[PDB]
Amino acid sequence: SDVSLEEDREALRKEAERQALAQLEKAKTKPVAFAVRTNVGYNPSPGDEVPVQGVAITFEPKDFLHIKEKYNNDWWIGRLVKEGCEVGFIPSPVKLDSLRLLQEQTLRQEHVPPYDVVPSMRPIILVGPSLKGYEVTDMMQKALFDFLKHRFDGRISITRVTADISLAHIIIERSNTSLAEVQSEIERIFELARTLQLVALDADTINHPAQLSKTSLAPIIVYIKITSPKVLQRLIKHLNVQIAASEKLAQCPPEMFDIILDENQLEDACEHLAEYLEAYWKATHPPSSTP
Amino acid sequence: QVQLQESGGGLVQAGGSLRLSCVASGRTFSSYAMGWFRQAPGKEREFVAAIDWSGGTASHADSVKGRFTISRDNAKNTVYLQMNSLKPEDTAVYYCAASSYWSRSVDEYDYWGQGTQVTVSS
Amino acid sequence: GQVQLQESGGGSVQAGGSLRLSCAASGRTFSKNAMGWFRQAPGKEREFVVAISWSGRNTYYADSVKGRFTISRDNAKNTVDLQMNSLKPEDSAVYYCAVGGDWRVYDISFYYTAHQYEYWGQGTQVTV
């Protein structure tokens, strides 16, 4: 019986792999259902019982994953958001938590959830050179938005966000001004990125990347940096409040920004931002997803 | 198998506030996205709100945006639905459900509660 | 003893100086393993310095060395290099390279934790 059942199970496992593989090919051109940012890394092992052997996706902490379908309770179908990465099998939180426990027992070693749902396209948010609401920063950011609207026409959505999305004590600030409106704007930003178009936000209340680091918006922070305090004073002529936060932005650790635009010429800064966003467009629109 | 139990339903008034809760069994609560669905009599249940695993991301139906707020605490295995500005159109049986996926489709949820009835007097 | 981590590039430098450390791994290809550097000063407990992911896409530095040190990795040659610039006397210690364990599921804290590293070099001295 032990031999006969192993033969029947091998034929059943072989057929399940063929259909699982066929389901994977269908998912190459399917729309992205949602995206997650990972808090863990995953190195697939032969014993993980992947629906198709060797076609589980490897990823690292803080990676972004585009999810296409639910295969079963243990497995999703999706891809790492990176050029050259194709759709594969991604473990669900149910599966990841069991693999994590097995590892801890093997090595004799309440975890934070491994995935956070984030927008399918990370929203672009500009910070710098100084405070928003003033002419110098507003003019330079409007110049960058106008360039993006032309360079990425038909591929980008630019929208204004007047709600304080940093509130996504803070109790007093939320009492100043409505979590309903903030949550509504958050969901609106998620919706704008659903079809994988680039999303750029004119967020009035976001002047520093620490104000939106703890959110699930996972934004692309673009730092328009005027390195010379004298040039800023020249352009301004409330200088005191403006010069202080430009100093504050310069003090920020560099890894808190995704792009630092410190080029001495504005046209070179626009090309730098355009090159970065074209690479992000490629990473989110692989050639295999278009047929 | 996760068991879910809703509570908090009853007879309420338009303009008031009501807080529903759902307690889950098992030790894998944080591995599931939690959703709330509501059901008119004789009709199929429809999406209300969903909250992701850590509670950092939520989605709300258009008709309840700004009025209803889903939340969770993984330490008590509990999901909440804060319903403010109750309208007569909110009268329904409310169900909580658990999914290993992220979704607002009924078919992609794996475990369901028995529901709790909310009647909003006009 | 099939796995061996050979380290080179230590020595003594004047403060504000620079040095390059390197570690060549042999015995395994270590293609999905992290690789990092720890250091230990006399009378001080061992402490994390820097680590690089198996892919080379992600690096992790201790705050005490951020901006001054940089790590790189050549997997074809199975080597890691640590460029240390603007060296300070508090950087004086024996530096050990290490290969991460065969992690199946891991978070960022694995990179900073010595007991998550499986193989170690013998150490190289670095003074001021």
Numbering used by the authors:
A (entry chain A): 70 to 178, 218 to 276, 287 to 295, 298 to 357, 366 to 419
B (entry chain B): 2 to 123
C (entry chain C): 1 to 128
From the paper:
High-voltage activated calcium channels (HVACCs) convert information encoded in electrical signals to Ca2+ influx into cells to drive important biological responses including synaptic transmission in neurons and muscle contraction in the heart. Mature HVACCs are multi-subunit complexes comprised of pore-forming α1 polypeptides assembled with auxiliary β, α2δ, and γ subunits. There are four CaVβ subunits isoforms (CaVβ1 - CaVβ4) encoded by distinct genes. Beyond surface density, CaVβs also regulate different aspects of channel gating including open probability (Po), voltage-dependence of activation and inactivation, and inactivation kinetics.
Nb.F3 also uses Sites 1 and 2 to bind CaVβ1b, and the way nb.F3 binds to CaVβ1b in the nb.F3:nb.E8:CaVβ1b complex is very similar to nb.F3:CaVβ2a components (RMSDCα = 0.731 Å). The nb.F3:nb.E8:CaVβ1b complex shows that the β1 selective nanobody nb.E8, which has a longer CDR3 than nb.F3, also has the canonical nanobody structure and uses its three CDRs to bind to the CaVβ1b SH3 domain face formed by the long loop between SH3 domain strands β1 and β2 opposite to the nb.F3 epitope. This interaction buries 853Å2 and involves a mixture of hydrogen bonds, salt bridges, and van der Waals interactions. One notable interaction is made by the Val103-Arg104 portion of CDR3. This loop wedges between the SH3 domain α2 helix and η1 loop allowing Arg104 to make a salt bridge with Asp117 and a series of backbone mediated hydrogen bonds to Asn112 and Gln172 of CaVβ1b, matching the region identified by our chimera studies, and thereby defining the positions that are important for the selectivity of nbE8 for CaVβ1 over other isoforms. Interestingly, the binding site for nb.E8 is on CaVβ1 SH3 rather than the NK domain that mediates high affinity binding to α1 subunits.
